[PDB]
C-alpha cells in the first residue's frame, strides 16, 4: 500500500541497493556498507571513477508520479502444512 | 544572401599552419570488444 499519504517527505529514510556483486539468494540480507569498485583499481574506499556507493535511496516526493510514489510492501509467509501450526485460521481444535 | 549561410566550409590547409591548424589524418576505430562475432580477431582463445 502506498505510504505517499504518510512516508512521502523526498523521503530519504527509505533506501535501496543500486548495485551488488551478484543476484540474491532468497531472504538474504546485506548490512555491509563497503565501497563499490567498477574498475580493476582498488578504490581506497572512496567514490569516483568506477568507484561508487552501491546503496541509493529512492526519494519519495508527494508530487512524484505513481512510479516514484512509495509503496509499503509487506509479506506474510508460511510453510503451508506438515509443520507445527502457530498462526492458524481461527478454527478451534475439534474433538 | 542575407542570413543565408553555407553549411560546410573548407579550411585553407597550408603547410604553414600551426601544429593544431595543420590537417591531421584522423581515424577512429569502431569495435564492440566481446559479445559480438569474432571476424577481425587474434587467436581469440585458441589453444594448442
Amino acid at each position, epitope marked *: 500500500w502506498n505510504s505517499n499519504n504518510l512516508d512521502s517527505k523526498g523521503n530519504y529514510n527509505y533506501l535501496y541497493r543500486l548495485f551488488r556483486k551478484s543476484n540474491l539468494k532468497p531472504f538474504e540480507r546485506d548490512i555491509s556498507t563497503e565501497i563499490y569498485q567498477a*574498475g*580493476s*583499481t582498488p578504490c*581506497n574506499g*572512496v*567514490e*569516483g*571513477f568506477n568507484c561508487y556507493f552501491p546503496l541509493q535511496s529512492y526519494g519519495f516526493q508527494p508530487t512524484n508520479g505513481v512510479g516514484y510514489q512509495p509503496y509499503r510492501v509487506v509479506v506474510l509467509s508460511f510453510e503451508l502444512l506438515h509443520a507445527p501450526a502457530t498462526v492458524c485460521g481461527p478454527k478451534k481444535s475439534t474433538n | 544572401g542575407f542570413n543565408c549561410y553555407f553549411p560546410l566550409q573548407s579550411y585553407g590547409f597550408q603547410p604553414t599552419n600551426g*601544429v*593544431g591548424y595543420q590537417p591531421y589524418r584522423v581515424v577512429v576505430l569502431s569495435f564492440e570488444l566481446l559479445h559480438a562475432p569474432a571476424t577481425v580477431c587474434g587467436p581469440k582463445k585458441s589453444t594448442n
Partner: antibody
Amino acid sequence: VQLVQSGAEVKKPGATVKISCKVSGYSFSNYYIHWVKQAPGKSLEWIGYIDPFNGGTSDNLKFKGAATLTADTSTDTAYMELSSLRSEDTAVYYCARSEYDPYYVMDYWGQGTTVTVSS
Amino acid sequence: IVLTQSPFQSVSPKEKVTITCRASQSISSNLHWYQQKPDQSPKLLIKYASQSISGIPSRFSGSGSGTDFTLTINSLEAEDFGIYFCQQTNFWPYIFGQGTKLEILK
C-alpha cells in the same frame, strides 16, 4: 600546478603498485595528467597520459605494466596502478599535468613517488 | 616517435650551452624541454619548442628546425646544474630526452 601522490613502496614483481596522484592547486578535469618513469640511475621515460574526464588512456608499449590510468573525479586523483612489476619498475613516477589537446605542456609534475619494485 | 639527447654536456660559467634534442624520423613543431636537478620533479623549461613557459629564466631558451630541437642556455651559474630533458610531441607516444647532466667548471 600541484600534485600529491602515493607513498613510498617496495613491490613484488608481478604485483601492483597503485600510485594515486591527487590534484591540488588546479582542476583535475581540465588537464591530461601525464605519467613518467624515472628509475634510480635512469632518465625520464613515457608511460602514459590520463585523461581526467576520459578513462581511456594512451599507455606506453615499451615497458608495459598494463598501466591503467584511472581518472577519479570525486577526489581529483589520477591513478597509475602499475602491474607487471619489476626491479626496473623501481622508479620515481611523476604524474604530469598537461593540456587536454595534442598540446602536451607539463611543468610541475607530481613531487615524485619513490617506489621500489623488488623482491 | 624517436629522439635522443646528448648524455651530458659539461660546460663552463658564463659560457652558453645549447642543449640538443635531435629527433629521429618524423618531427612536429611542438616540443618541450626540462631541467631536473637530481631526484626531483622535472620542471618544464620550453613549450612547443618555440616558447619558454612562464617562470623559466631568460637564459633558458628554446627553438627548433626540422629534426633539431634546441634548449639554448646561457651563462652558467654554479647552482644551476641539473639534468635537461626534452619531449617529442605527437607522432605517437614519446621518448623523453635522456637528459643533460650539467657539470660546470670553475
